[PDB]
Design a protein around this ligand. Structure first.
Ligand SMILES: CNC(=O)CO[C@H]1CO[C@@H]2OC[C@H](OC(=O)N[C@@H](Cc3ccccc3)[C@H](O)CN(CC(C)C)S(=O)(=O)c3ccc(OC)cc3)[C@@H]21
Ligand SMILES: [Cl-]
Ligand SMILES: [Cl-]
Ligand SMILES: [Cl-]
Lengths: 99, 99
């Protein structure tokens, strides 16, 4: 698809059996989701943006589907104000900026 | 250009005659730069990110070049961790997401 930026670039993702809305976010290194359960190991991490840091749980090798596109990668879970899809998953679906 | 997302999408911008580095950020509604001087009057704005809110100064109708592409619009100045070019200016330079 070609996604305009007149509005926030929101998409539906499938993750851990759940459907969720998330923002396609080229300014995020990592994918960060609001509190949810995921299977497997995790380790604590601090991630920072505007306004400072939050503590998250880092899960590796999580399957996700974005716009019909399957990918696997690291998902950070914690008290983000909104779900963002970061570059670590945008690359996998072949997402580019164009102008 | 077509910019992939394996690395941060950092580009050179020009504002007030000076070059800076900034992140092309589809997850940002607005453009927020690190402390700097701009002309005219400013208005207050609170913007929120991952770690909470910050107060910024809002300057309107500012000329800014982004990867050589000319824009004129609203620039927020405050204690952001990194310069970010948000959708307000990404739309001016004709940027889309594509996959
Ligand atoms: C300190 N941390 C660092 O150095 C790097 O660590 C960062 C980078 O990668 C990592 O992944 C998750 C996090 O990334 C971000 O948070 N990304 C930020 C941009 C940004 C990039 C680097 C640092 C700080 C912010 C978003 O892409 C934009 N907005 C955040 C929203 C999408 C959560 S915004 O910035 O809050 C904002 C809100 C309103 C506005 O107008 C209204 C305009 C902007 C970590
Ligand atoms: Cl990853
Ligand atoms: Cl590629
Ligand atoms: Cl603007």
């Amino acid at each position: 698809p070609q996604i305009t930026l007149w509005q926030r670039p929101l998409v539906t993702i499938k993750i851990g059996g759940q459907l969720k809305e998330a923002l396609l976010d080229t300014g995020a290194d990592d994918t960060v989701l609001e509190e949810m359960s995921l299977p497997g190991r995790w380790k604590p991490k601090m991630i920072g943006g505007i306004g400072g840091f939050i503590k998250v749980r880092q899960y590796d090798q999580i399957p996700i589907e974005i716009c019909g596109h399957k990918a696997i990668g690291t998902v950070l879970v914690g008290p983000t104000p909104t779900n963002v899809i970061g570059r670590n998953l945008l690359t996998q679906i072949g997402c580019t900026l164009n102008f």
